[PDB]
Design a protein around this ligand. Sequence first.
Ligand SMILES: Nc1ncnc2c1ncn2[C@@H]1O[C@H](COP(=O)(O)OP(=O)(O)O)[C@@H](O)[C@H]1O
Ligand SMILES: [Cl-]
Ligand SMILES: [Cl-]
Ligand SMILES: [Cl-]
Ligand SMILES: [K+]
Ligand SMILES: [Mg+2]
Ligand SMILES: [Xe]
Ligand SMILES: [Xe]
Length: 316
Amino acid sequence: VRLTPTMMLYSGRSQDGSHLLKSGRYLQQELPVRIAHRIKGFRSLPFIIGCNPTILHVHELYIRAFQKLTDFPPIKDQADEAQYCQLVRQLLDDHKDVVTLLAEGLRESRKHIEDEKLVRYFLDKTLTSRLGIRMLATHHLALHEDKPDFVGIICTRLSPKKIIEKWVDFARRLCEHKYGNAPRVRINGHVAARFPFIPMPLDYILPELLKNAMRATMESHLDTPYNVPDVVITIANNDVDLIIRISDRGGGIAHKDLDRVMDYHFTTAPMHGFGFGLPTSRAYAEYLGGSLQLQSLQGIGTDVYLRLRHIDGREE
Ligand SMILES: Nc1ncnc2c1ncn2[C@@H]1O[C@H](COP(=O)(O)OP(=O)(O)O)[C@@H](O)[C@H]1O
Ligand SMILES: [Cl-]
Ligand SMILES: [Cl-]
Ligand SMILES: [Cl-]
Ligand SMILES: [K+]
Ligand SMILES: [Mg+2]
Ligand SMILES: [Xe]
Ligand SMILES: [Xe]
């Protein structure tokens, strides 16, 4: 139905809860293959990195997950599909702090290091496979519920302005709690657009980009925390993609850091996180068929351009 990388999100012709069985069976044939690929990923990690405790723990979670998934019998009826949903849920929860554990595990290993680009390739490949598995899984689960304007995790009439505002309020609150104020965010462009879209990736990316913009703005206006320049977001909606530009007046990204900011762990900083925001968002966007580009005006501010392809057709 709705495609993305090579994964499919089924648009269920409901009826006699029949579509659910077709989706459960798909999910059941898909998850163990994706889990195995990531186990191969841990097996090929440099020995010294792979021997790190936390990394081993995560490696063991993936083996365990592969085993429970492999041991569940083929879904034959509603009775099965329903217990499978309990398995999927237990796994999503068990793997809740995986990105966090990976970042910690890998943080130390590269005092010890290997092939400069070797780890980035590993984290890009692991984080995005994770996203895709969670999208598949969350979508099957959601196909049970009946939420207005959704087919599973797919919103049928998503408003970019509305999802942006949701994350603006969130980020502004993290920022006010920390600095006592937060820049206001103005939104322009196609503010009335509504189209079929999956909001999950935007739910990770948008708050990461807004956190970066608000902090850089606050950190560069220490003399007047009570009066800082607005962050400005422009929405461009065309038949090919959705573009969201986030411009701040927070001083820009220094020429001396420009080439490091897209590296996992790199950071200039607790609100910010742990240097994963940008490299993760870009991996996610490219995984989905879009991109994330930065334009730095050193001494003035930064423009961040997020592009995501529309479902599998154009759109207004
Ligand atoms: N909009 C921005 N303006 C200024 N600096 C930014 C901006 N976005 C990101 N950066 C810089 O890039 C670094 C990397 O950011 P990121 O990967 O999100 O990690 P973190 O926020 O946790 O440091 C930041 O620490 C900061 O130096
Ligand atoms: Cl092992
Ligand atoms: Cl195995
Ligand atoms: Cl999408
Ligand atoms: K970084
Ligand atoms: Mg960040
Ligand atoms: Xe899962
Ligand atoms: Xe998982």
